[PDB]
Design a protein around this ligand. Structure first.
Ligand SMILES: [Ca+2]
Ligand SMILES: [Ca+2]
Ligand SMILES: [Ca+2]
Ligand SMILES: [Ca+2]
Ligand SMILES: [Zn+2]
Ligand SMILES: [Zn+2]
Length: 365
């Protein structure tokens, strides 16, 4: 079918069968989900309030749908492939008797078959599968995915995000996906992107599948670690490294005749102690400087702030927080902003955040 266009996904257990022990269903379920995330790059979260994205429900005969139930047997659950609205809900025929055991009609086994569906999978012609529609009421903590089901879950989603399997996946540090990966500064230099962090820098996007973090003292000479702001000027091979009241010019990875130097000879007041984010716009020939609260634009081709400058980041850039960690230019009319573990696709052409993404996306985790 289609599939879920999100790494992280929600469920809410909507109501409880009185075949009960609430808590046993929390489990049977929480756990059903687990089955899937354990072979699979997803997470699952039981929120208790607001509108979850997978919905478990226990209703009977005619419930809502157009696709009614039928009583004791035959259909026991149906769930809805992904899709807003009622897209991924898993529903359960209350006229059965659900169990932690294998008297009655197991809700571990059915919850899991039917979460797939919710998920994307059709059936498995595969007998051995946690469903050959023909529920194999089997032992319970030892049980596991017929390799088959593993394929089309895997077809649809991967194999999991850094090592070798079933067994499941681990979760690193300094890392490509601690999802609270913030930035010192960041830029691209002609077709790569340098991502700064303390002594670290991770580099690229460019057809190179995957991000290799390294120390900054290896590519870089006359310069400190821990880098606050940066941009580029692709037509002159220049990367500009900013920290504290001083900056560094660069070429071809090589520090042109003189640095560091001051930031003030570039122009600002002495009221200004540090540049926080910076981005150069070739469309129109200007650099954007960001001082917590406010910003400044430098006319590159004249060496001259344009008139009227400091300014107010939010008044002029719609919704970008009053402090910004990193900006950088998209080879075609955007700036991508990095405020916290957050980053914004920002169309500068009609000013509007248009995509909000995980601070760490081009490590397409
Ligand atoms: Ca839903
Ligand atoms: Ca039924
Ligand atoms: Ca019942
Ligand atoms: Ca910064
Ligand atoms: Zn239904
Ligand atoms: Zn089914």
């Amino acid at each position: 079918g289609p599939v879920w266009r999100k790494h992280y996904i929600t469920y809410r257990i909507n109501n409880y069968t009185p075949d009960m022990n609430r808590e046993d269903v929390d489990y049977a379920i929480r756990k059903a989900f687990q089955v899937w995330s354990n072979v699979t790059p997803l997470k699952f979260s039981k929120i208790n309030t607001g509108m979850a994205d997978i919905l478990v429900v226990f209703a009977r005969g005619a419930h809502g749908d157009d696709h009614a139930f039928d009583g004791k047997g035959g259909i026991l659950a149906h769930a809805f492939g992904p899709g807003s609205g009622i897209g991924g809900d898993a529903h359960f025929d209350e006229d059965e008797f659900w169990t932690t055991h294998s008297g009655g009609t197991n809700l571990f086994l059915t919850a899991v078959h039917e979460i797939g569906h919710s998920l994307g999978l059709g059936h498995s012609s595969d007998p051995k599968a946690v469903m050959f529609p023909t529920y194999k009421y089997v032992d319970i903590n030892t049980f596991r995915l017929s390799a088959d089901d593993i394929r089309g879950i895997q077809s649809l989603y991967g194999d999991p995000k850094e090592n070798q399997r079933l067994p499941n996946p681990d979760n690193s540090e300094p890392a490509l996906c601690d999802p609270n990966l913030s930035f010192d500064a960041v830029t691209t230099v002609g077709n790569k992107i340098f991502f700064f962090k303390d002594r670290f820098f991770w580099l690229k996007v460019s057809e190179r599948p995957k991000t290799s973090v390294n120390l900054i003292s290896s590519l870089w000479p006359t310069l400190p670690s821990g880098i606050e702001a940066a941009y580029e000027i692709e037509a002159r091979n220049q990367v500009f490294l900013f920290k504290d009241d001083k900056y560094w010019l660069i070429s071809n990875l090589r520090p042109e005749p003189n640095y560091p130097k001051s930031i003030h000879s570039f122009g600002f007041p002495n009221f200004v102690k540090k540049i926080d984010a910076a981005v150069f716009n070739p469309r129109f020939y200007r650099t954007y400087f960001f001082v917590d609260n406010q910003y400044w634009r430098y006319d590159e081709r004249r060496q001259m702030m344009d008139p009227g400058y400091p300014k107010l980041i939010t008044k002029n850039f719609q919704g970008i927080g009053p402090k910004i960690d990193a900006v950088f230019y998209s080879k075609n009319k955007y700036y991508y902003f990095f405020q916290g573990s957050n980053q914004f696709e920002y169309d500068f052409l009609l000013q509007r955040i248009t995509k909000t993404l995980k601070s760490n996306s081009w490590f397409g985790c």
